[PDB]
Design an enzyme around this catalytic site. Structure first.
Site, PDB file in Angstrom:
ATOM      1  CE  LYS A 110      25.401 -21.751 -23.171  1.00 30.57           C
ATOM      2  NZ  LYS A 110      24.529 -21.373 -24.335  1.00 30.57           N
ATOM      3  NE  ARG A 158      21.688 -35.413 -25.055  1.00 26.76           N
ATOM      4  CZ  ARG A 158      21.114 -35.999 -24.227  1.00 26.76           C
ATOM      5  NH1 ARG A 158      21.594 -37.465 -23.855  1.00 26.76           N
ATOM      6  NH2 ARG A 158      20.092 -35.433 -23.183  1.00 26.76           N
ATOM      7  NE  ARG A 218      25.647 -28.354 -20.267  1.00 27.72           N
ATOM      8  CZ  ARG A 218      25.072 -28.969 -21.350  1.00 27.72           C
ATOM      9  NH1 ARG A 218      24.863 -30.259 -21.118  1.00 27.72           N
ATOM     10  NH2 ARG A 218      24.589 -28.349 -22.213  1.00 27.72           N
ATOM     11  CG  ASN A 243      24.516 -24.461 -19.887  1.00 27.26           C
ATOM     12  OD1 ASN A 243      23.421 -24.354 -19.977  1.00 27.26           O
ATOM     13  ND2 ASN A 243      25.374 -24.612 -21.071  1.00 27.26           N
ATOM     14  CG  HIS A 298      24.361 -25.798 -27.492  1.00 29.43           C
ATOM     15  ND1 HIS A 298      23.536 -25.907 -26.717  1.00 29.43           N
ATOM     16  CD2 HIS A 298      24.397 -25.924 -28.490  1.00 29.43           C
ATOM     17  CE1 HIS A 298      22.557 -26.514 -27.569  1.00 29.43           C
ATOM     18  NE2 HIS A 298      23.403 -26.531 -28.857  1.00 29.43           N
TER      19      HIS A 298
END
Ligand SMILES: Nc1nc2c(ncn2[C@@H]2O[C@H](COP(=O)(O)OP(=O)(O)OP(=O)(O)O)[C@@H](O)[C@H]2O)c(=O)[nH]1
Ligand SMILES: Nc1nc2c(ncn2[C@@H]2O[C@H](COP(=O)(O)OP(=O)(O)OP(=O)(O)O)[C@@H](O)[C@H]2O)c(=O)[nH]1
Ligand SMILES: Nc1nc2c(ncn2[C@@H]2O[C@H](COP(=O)(O)OP(=O)(O)O)[C@@H](O)[C@H]2O)c(=O)[nH]1
Ligand SMILES: [Mg+2]
Ligand SMILES: [Mg+2]
Lengths: 90, 442, 430, 332, 442
Positions: free
Chosen positions: D200, D277, D297, D307, D310
């Site tokens: 991000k 994940r 995270r 967070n 992604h």
């Protein structure tokens, strides 16, 4: 007189013309004297920014090419995924 | 569908620049006449046709003439940015001005230029299939605008007959003034304009200055701002011809609804959401708010107060996102108000129009972007105060026959002053009589 | 729309030399005559004052006249003198002797045909001719007599054009010539019949301009002629540049002259301020308007406070708002309402031109029609009556050929001019 | 250092759909800021303390958040700042050869510790002509960067990482590699058995990017593609279509992803989507700080909108996201 | 927002040089009136506006006139370092001095120069939009300062009316003296000053010499030190107009809070952290220490002892890093003290102001750099002692008509001495009456 003399001493030192002459009568050539030149060159002029002419009209500033651009009236384009899907669906 | 625009003199050409800037930007025509279409599929909509015609190569050219006796402003147009847009024959310029003399324009100098202008208008009218009127822009304060405008309107009225002529006219402001001889030219213009025009729209520069000071935040306005506002008004009134809507209004419906008697054709104009970009996002702008706005005298483009008179007819043009039910609720609320009064012989006082296209935003402009607007044209007895002040200034000046030798030397009989002044006196008394309540029944 | 200039006598030739320097500078014309400017806005009206000679060159549309070539050799020797066309210099072989009758009747009729031939050659070359502009003094000899002779001939040959004059008149305090009142009276008699609009300048007013406003320690005639050349080149600016509200000499005349004899005007030019002070105060429309009506900046000895304005005109040069101009002219008219003639509803015309004179942010030239001009003529008439009762120098004029009746006609006409101004000063609506 | 910085910034107004310009001043003696409006010549905000803003984050092309507004620094508004940043405007290229792909995260982290700003990055394979001329391998990582005293700083990579970095300083070679390495063209991304992780913008400005990439390498994953792209609002909306109506912070995610440039990596491993994940952690950092303290995270996230990273959730969309990042954005 | 400064005579011009040096250095205007060519940001700030106006080129020029009858001091300003700051028209100089004669300044010589001063002030006042008072600096001991200062204050008071006029005045010290005729000039000045001033600030050179000897370590002080202290005081009082703060104080609030009755307008002034750099590192300087300092008589700039009277009102100006709670705790501690007494009709004796801008340091200066300072102006009955000693010296001289022939020859009736002496006697009686306690029985 002091500020005028300081102004005339402010410019760069050394086909040409005499803008002004502090002396009333110039020595000239031979014994021939001459005179009548202006005392100061700043009559009907500004010493802050002389030699500046503002050759620009109102319409050129008001109706320039920036104001006629149509790119500002277009709605924003879609994302790449939506473009691909639009082509496929069509 | 089509309408032809006639621009006369200094005010008319300068207002024309703003108008054609707006019509180009609204349709999407580039300064060189081309339309930068985004897709080949589909077809280009016909809405331009009211103001543009296309060549077989697809260039657009506009249905207008620019008329002046001095070259300088038209030569500026010829050398400006829109050089390639206009046809060179349409931009007609003489050698020397009418020097603020109506007589010089009408008798001596305009008589030479008028036949070329009529030939150009004929060449335009032959390239039409549904002409439905002439729109004329001029100022009555100057010599060539008054004299050549009157002479040309007379010739069109003989040649074309029944076709309608709607004028947007810049009149001398009630205390701001620019030249000494303004009353003579305005009286003599108004005499010819009385017989040969169907609707006359009144403008005063002092009102548009007041409007730009109070609503917009501009301390030092100049003519380009006023001309852009005028262009917006013309675009709003002509939008009813050009885009889809719920209740369309043809120019003959305008003439039928606003004019009760053939001399009573002078109308007031106002425009509602004059607002700056910073103010516009703090407030909603619903239908009822802008409807309440158009009746306040702070919104008008002519310096008159309608509380000193009576309305005869109103024509309300809404463009943008409006629903008829909100228009009906607004008009019923206005009708409830006690400071709005109609003459008792006009019970059904309103005409409405509703168009779906919201107003366009111009890159250099000072108006905010808004989803809806309303524009009003209205007939009211208050206009009699403007003539009374021009006639009073005429009487003071004419008492000493001030400057008259210029007018007599350039070709006019002295009698014409008295005829025009008596006709304007009769028009003032007509507005007195029509506004008188019918208390007498026999 | 081309103007033809005429320069007569010593004062006229010197002022003309400074005027054509100013005009050549504003249009970027080299002293060799070559165009060297840097924008099309300069070029597009060059025709108004210049004719085009081959491969680049421009020549100035002016006629130079004098009775002894001394002045002509002085202007030819100046820094811009080369630009002038050799055939345009017309001169005789003996002086005017400061005598009106010699200049009008003996050497005048001898030379005048060659001047009319040159003026016709110059006039017929224009595609459309605007009015003539003439600069001369009334106190001199050849300037007054031959200038008014030529004015009468041009008014016979071109009655539909405009006739505009700039004129120097004798000071109330010091004479340069003893017989000044005769020459002035005869010239004013000729002008009031022939002219369409006449502007008058006192050298005393230029000295007061220099001393109070510019604080010059040792002014010279070059400064006075620069002020005059600046205003002269300013009056025509709307003819030759674009603007928001164009104006023209005929439109000025139409707005300024209420009745055809009342064509004598006051002159002013606003942005005057000494080189030491100028760093301390920026240009703005209130400052220009305040200076514009201040009598220190006006080029006549008469003061506006003793009269009333019939009409006035202001021509603005520069990029400026119309709101400030209209509201300033309204505020000045309202605050000083007793000084404006009440049977005219608005006395001031405004005009706006985009291009200012070089080195100024903004400029205005002011033309005023005020009844206080009557005070100048009365003083000259007094001095004339003092000399005439005693036949003080009359034999010179009578020996040249003048009828004494000419002197009585000129006296009567000047007295009637003063009376008409005085009557309009005290007029009322009733 | 400085006594006062001055920048002019643009703020994209979502309600008005205009772009507004302001003037931002930073006083370094006591860490206060103040904003003015250029169009109105009026004050926008007094001198108020703002400790989250530091002088290190102030550079051209950066993004900052002042009272829930995203401001993008555009141009110097003063000549003191222009003279202080007289350097730091020349762009150079540092390559990483085949032997250095295992150490690329440490290289990027070392560049960030040296006050260097990365203006582009990509994993490419060069044509043979540039391969011979410059002296690099076929498969390499091209990093474009700028900063103060750049050449003297990057000389330390020759001794920290022997024989895996090539530095380019000549403008002609920089222009050639800019034309060749970046710009429209092909990609090395696979189309099956892959996963996409996105860094991000806030983590980009804070600069944990090297640690994230090196953690991915350490865990055992393979990087098959990498690049930096700037997302428009519509692109951000089309990227997060599946998150509409499901998570409460959809619009905040849209504006965060449209705020500035973002890095996108591709990961290939066994059961790639589930593994990525698991390594990234749950969506909410609060759960991470209590039950999953070792996840990415937890270290690089402060709330649901920001967070840090992604990752793909549904295994049906991994080639879709890989295509959207490495073909639609890259090629056109 | 704006204030206009008028400097008269020698003391007032010399104190003006220090004031404008300080105000330049506080805002940052260079001595040539410009700003640094690099620090410009695009959108400047209004704080200068209280004292400077900018030209369209961005040069700054100050809102002051310098008035003198002798040329020498103004020629020093014209030839000094600040030549380019002042407008040359603003610097007005006569030919010859008023020779310690009030009559020569007021009647004979000032009458020619006074109309130029009013024209300059009018030209300044027309270029304003929120003028809120005049500040005047002069000495009453000399002839031109007394006579022309009085004449100019009378004319200003008729022309401008309600606008406030605050004077800073150097009175003749109680035993240090410079000229023989000082009592006559000070009495005649004070007669005019009573009617035509809103607040009068009192100074004695002997007190500022004592203050510079005890607190600063200066054995041989000179006028530049005193003038720098006065300039600092004026900057402190006007800081409330120019910078952000917790509790602002407009110049009308001083007059509303400090003046109980229209004649009782003469006030004492003092300043707290006058300290040298070497002392500054031995001591902390919290709010309570400087608040305790401002009430000690060793801090005062006028040679009077306030323990011989009662305070009527105090105005305390704090500038710098101060918090209101410390001001409240300090004022409550001061209020507790037994050697500080207030008249029983003034229970709420204090007005406070708090501004964030700390005091400026001047390159050649002798004060240390400090984070906070406080300045006090206070109204007290002790001032009656200052007038009584001048009146005694007048009575001693006037008993023999010691110098009167100069004044009567230069244009004054002998009666004017007795009128002024009776007015000052009435002012003394006012200060006796205002300080009494009555209606004790209930
Ligand atoms: N609103 C507006 N008013 C204008 C504009 N131009 C001129 N006017 C006004 O119209 C009047 C002047 O009329 P002009 O158009 O200049 O007269 P003209 O048609 O040129 O007539 P001549 O002078 O004989 O050539 C004045 O009241 C001006 O203020 C304009 O562009 N917009
Ligand atoms: N604090 C201070 N006091 C001064 C200064 N100059 C003069 N004084 C005092 O003021 C009194 C003298 O007043 P002056 O200003 O010289 O009188 P003047 O205004 O020049 O009047 P004329 O002599 O007629 O020109 C004496 O008490 C001096 O001590 C100064 O620069 N600072
Ligand atoms: N303002 C001005 N006046 C001048 C100039 N030259 C001469 N004069 C005046 O004009 C008068 C002399 O007239 P002159 O030109 O010699 O008359 P002429 O002999 O017929 O040419 C005197 O009042 C001179 O002061 C000049 O350059 N400027
Ligand atoms: Mg015109
Ligand atoms: Mg003195």
């Amino acid at each position: 007189e002091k500020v005028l003399e300081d102004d005339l001493l402010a410019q760069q030192p050394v086909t040409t013309v005499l803008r002004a002459s502090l002396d009333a009568i110039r020595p000239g050539k031979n014994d021939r004297f001459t005179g009548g030149y202006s005392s100061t060159p700043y009559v009907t002029s500004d010493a802050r920014n002389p030699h500046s002419r503002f050759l620009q009209t109102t319409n050129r500033e008001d109706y320039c090419e920036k104001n006629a651009d149509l790119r500002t009236l277009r709605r924003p384009d879609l994302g790449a995924r939506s473009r691909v899907l639009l082509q496929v669906a069509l | 569908r089509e309408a032809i625009c006639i621009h006369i003199g200094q005010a008319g050409c300068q207002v024309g620049n703003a108008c054609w800037e707006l019509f180009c930007l609204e349709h999407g025509i580039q300064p060189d006449g081309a339309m930068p279409s985004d897709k080949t599929i589909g077809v280009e909509d016909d809405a331009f046709n009211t103001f543009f015609s296309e060549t077989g190569a697809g260039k657009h050219v506009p249905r207008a003439v620019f008329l002046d006796l001095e070259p300088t402003v038209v030569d500026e147009v010829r050398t400006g940015t829109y050089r390639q847009l206009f046809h060179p024959e349409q931009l007609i310029s003489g050698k020397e001005d009418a020097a603020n003399n109506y007589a010089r324009g009408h008798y001596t100098i305009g008589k030479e230029i008028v036949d070329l202008c009529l030939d150009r208008i004929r060449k335009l009218a032959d390239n039409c299939t549904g002409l439905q009127g002439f729109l004329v822009y001029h100022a009555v304060g100057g010599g060539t605008g008054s004299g050549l405008g009157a002479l040309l309107l007379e010739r069109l009225s003989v040649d074309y007959g029944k076709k309608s002529k709607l004028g947007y006219t810049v009149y001398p402001s009630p205390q701001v003034s620019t030249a000494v001889v303004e009353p003579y030219n305005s009286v003599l213009s108004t005499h010819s304009l009385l017989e040969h025009t169907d609707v006359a729209a009144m403008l005063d520069n002092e009102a548009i200055y007041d409007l730009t000071r109070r609503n917009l935040d501009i301390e030092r306005p100049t003519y380009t701002n006023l001309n852009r506002l005028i262009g917006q008004v013309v675009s709003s009134l002509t939008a009813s011809l050009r885009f889809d809507g719920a209740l369309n209004v043809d120019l003959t419906e305008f003439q039928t609804n606003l004019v009760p008697y053939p001399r009573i054709h002078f109308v007031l104009t106002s425009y509602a959401p004059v607002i700056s970009a910073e103010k516009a996002y703090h407030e909603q702008l619903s239908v009822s708010e802008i409807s309440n706005a158009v009746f306040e005298p702070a919104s008008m483009m002519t310096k008159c107060d309608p509380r000193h008179g009576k309305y005869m007819a109103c024509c309300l043009m809404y463009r943008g996102d409006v629903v008829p039910k909100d228009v009906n609720a607004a008009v019923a609320t206005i009708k409830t108000k006690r400071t709005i009064q109609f003459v008792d012989w006009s019970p059904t006082g309103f005409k409405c129009g509703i168009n779906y296209q919201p107003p366009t935003v111009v890159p250099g402009g000072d108006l905010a972007k808004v989803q809806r607007a309303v524009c009003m044209i209205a007939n009211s007895t208050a206009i009699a105060e403007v003539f009374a002040r021009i006639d009073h200034k005429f009487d003071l000046m004419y008492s000493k026959r001030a400057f008259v030798h210029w007018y007599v030397g350039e070709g006019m009989e002295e009698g014409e002053f008295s005829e025009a002044r008596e006709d304007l006196a009769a028009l003032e008394k007509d507005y007195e009589e029509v506004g008188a309540e019918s208390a007498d029944m026999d | 729309r081309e103007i033809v200039c005429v320069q007569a006598g010593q004062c006229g030739n010197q002022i003309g030399s400074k005027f054509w320097e100013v005009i050549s500078d504003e249009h970027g014309v080299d002293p060799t005559g070559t165009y060297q400017g840097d924008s099309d806005l300069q070029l597009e009206r060059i025709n108004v004052y210049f004719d085009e000679a081959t491969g680049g060159r421009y020549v100035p549309r002016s006629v130079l006249i004098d009775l002894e070539p001394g002045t002509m050799d002085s202007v030819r020797a100046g820094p811009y003198g080369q630009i002038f066309r050799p055939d345009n210099f017309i001169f005789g072989q003996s002086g005017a002797g400061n005598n009106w009758a010699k200049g009008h009747y003996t050497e005048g009729a001898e030379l005048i045909d060659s001047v009319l031939d040159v003026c016709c050659k110059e006039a017929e070359s224009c595609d459309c001719l605007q009015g003539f502009q003439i600069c001369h003094s009334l106190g001199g000899g050849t300037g007054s007599g031959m200038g008014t002779l030529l004015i009468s001939k041009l008014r016979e040959q071109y009655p539909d054009r405009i006739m505009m004059t700039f004129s120097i008149i004798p000071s109330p305090k010091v004479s340069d010539t003893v017989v000044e009142p005769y020459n002035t009276t005869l010239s004013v008699h000729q002008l009031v019949e022939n002219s369409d609009e006449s502007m008058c300048i006192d050298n005393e007013a230029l000295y007061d301009i220099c001393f109070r406003t510019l604080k010059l320690t040792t002014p010279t005639f070059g400064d006075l002629n620069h002020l005059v050349s600046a205003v002269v080149s300013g009056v025509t600016c709307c003819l030759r540049f674009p603007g928001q509200l164009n104006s023209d000499l005929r439109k000025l005349a139409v707005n300024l002259v209420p009745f055809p004899r009342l064509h004598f005007f006051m002159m002013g030019f606003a942005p005057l301020t000494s080189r030491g002070s100028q760093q301390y105060r920026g240009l703005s429309v209130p400052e220009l308007t305040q200076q514009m009506f201040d009598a220190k900046n006006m080029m006549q000895a008469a003061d506006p406070r003793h009269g009333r304005y019939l009409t006035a005109s202001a021509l603005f040069r520069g990029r400026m708002s119309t709101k400030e101009v209209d509201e300033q002219m309204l505020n000045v008219q309202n605050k000083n309402s007793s000084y404006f003639i009440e049977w005219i509803p608005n006395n001031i015309k405004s005009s706006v031109c985009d291009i200012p004179p070089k080195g100024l942010k903004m400029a205005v030239t002011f033309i005023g029609n005020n009844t206080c001009i009557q005070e100048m003529f009365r003083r000259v008439g007094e001095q004339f009556t003092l000399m005439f009762r005693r036949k003080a120098f009359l034999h010179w004029y009578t020996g040249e050929g003048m009828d004494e009746m000419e002197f009585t006609e000129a006296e009567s006409n000047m007295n009637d001019l003063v009376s008409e101004y005085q009557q309009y000063q005290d007029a009322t609506i009733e | 250092a400085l006594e006062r910085y001055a920048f002019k910034v643009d703020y994209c107004d979502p309600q008005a759909n205009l772009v507004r310009q302001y003037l931002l001043l930073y006083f370094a003696e006591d860490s206060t800021i103040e904003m003015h409006d250029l169009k109105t010549k009026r004050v926008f905000l007094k001198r108020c303390a703002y400790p989250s803003l530091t002088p290190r984050e102030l550079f051209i092309g950066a993004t900052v958040g002042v009272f829930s507004r995203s401001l993008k620094l555009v141009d110097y508004g003063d000549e003191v700042t222009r003279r202080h940043f007289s350097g730091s405007e020349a762009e150079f290229v540092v390559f990483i050869q085949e032997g250095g792909l295992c150490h690329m995260g440490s290289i990027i982290d070392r560049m960030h510790t040296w006050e260097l700003r990365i203006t582009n990055i990509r994993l490419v394979d060069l044509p043979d002509s540039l391969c011979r001329d410059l002296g690099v391998s076929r498969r390499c990582v091209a990093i474009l960067f700028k900063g103060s005293n750049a050449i003297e700083k990057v000389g330390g990579l020759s001794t920290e990482f022997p024989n895996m970095t090539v530095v380019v300083a000549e403008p002609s070679d920089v222009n050639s590699v800019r034309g060749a390495a970046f710009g429209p063209g092909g990609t090395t991304a696979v189309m099956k058995n892959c996963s996409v992780c996105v860094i991000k913008p806030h983590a980009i400005m804070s600069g944990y990017q090297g640690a994230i990439i090196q953690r991915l390498i350490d865990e055992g994953f393979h990087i098959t593609a990498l690049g930096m792209y700037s997302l428009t609002v519509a692109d951000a909306e089309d990227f997060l279509e599946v998150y509409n109506g499901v998570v409460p912070e959809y619009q905040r995610l849209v504006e965060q992803m449209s705020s500035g440039p973002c890095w996108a990596v591709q990961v290939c491993a066994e059961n790639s989507v589930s593994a990525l994940r698991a390594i990234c952690g749950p969506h909410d950092p609060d759960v991470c700080h209590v039950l999953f303290p070792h996840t990415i995270r937890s270290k690089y996230g402060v709330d649901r909108t920001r967070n840090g990273v992604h990752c793909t959730d549904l295994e049906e969309d991994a080639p879709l996201e890989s295509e959207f990042f490495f073909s639609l954005l890259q090629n056109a």
